[PDB]
Design a protein around this ligand. Structure first.
Ligand SMILES: O=c1cc(-c2ccc(F)cc2)oc2ccccc12
Ligand SMILES: [Zn+2]
Lengths: 161, 47
């Protein structure tokens, strides 16, 4: 049920998504070990993910949360990087996409910093890097990230290093 | 998949040491996220 629609670089929507991607790069405490050494990206393509069933699944849950939280879904736009990007865009997020060993328990993790999500594109800790060169800092191979609509509702605040 | 803390729908991981890090978030239901945009990109080597 999923179709992918290419955005033109001239589209204000392409431009605002690219700006969120580029502007939320930071340096990481691993010196680039997991995600590579970089300060910015070369954006090759931005596609809108269209799936009516998955969208209706999201908005149904969003209304449930909102009704439990004084009509406030606390919806954010956040990054997600995963080796399972292809399954996610076709079948939706579920338990198979969870970070079982994550520091806040087994759930599905999202980042404000696109560069944090970039650390997970090739797996936890960057895995063994790109499939072709086995390089976590590969400047050749094409990577994919998701920019996702996320319902937080009432969120438990964890202070952490 | 774990459960959200009782009375909550998600967890926010607030950075407490690295002053430049932004927040990270966890949901425990797949239905609480929709993958709106697929971004294809390369990282760029600093000059
Ligand atoms: O984008 C993320 C993906 C994942 C992720 C982890 C394990 C997987 F198997 C798939 C994705 O972890 C993160 C942790 C913190 C912030 C963002 C992410
Ligand atoms: Zn490569």
């Amino acid at each position: 049920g999923t179709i992918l629609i290419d955005l033109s670089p001239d589209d204000k929507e392409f431009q605002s998504v690219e700006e969120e991607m580029q502007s939320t790069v930071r340096e990481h405490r691993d010196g680039g070990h997991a995600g590579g050494i970089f300060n910015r990206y070369n954006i090759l393509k931005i596609q809108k993910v269209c799936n009516k069933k998955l969208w209706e699944r999201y908005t149904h849950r969003r209304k449930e949360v909102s009704e439990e939280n004084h009509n406030h879904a606390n919806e954010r736009m956040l990054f997600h990087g995963s080796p399972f990007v292809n399954a996610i865009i076709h079948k939706g997020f579920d338990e198979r996409h969870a970070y079982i060993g994550g520091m806040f328990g087994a759930g599905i993790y999202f980042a404000e910093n696109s560069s944090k999500s970039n650390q997970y594109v090739y797996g936890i800790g960057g895995g063994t890097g790109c499939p072709v060169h086995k390089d976590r800092s590969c400047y050749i191979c094409h990577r994919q990230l998701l920019f996702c609509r996320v319902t937080l509702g009432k969120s438990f605040l964890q202070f952490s290093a | 998949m774990a459960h959200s803390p009782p009375g909550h729908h998600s967890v926010t991981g607030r950075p407490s040491v690295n002053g430049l890090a932004l927040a990270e978030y966890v949901i425990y239901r797949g239905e609480q996220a929709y993958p709106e945009y697929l971004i294809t990109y390369q990282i760029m080597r600093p000059e």
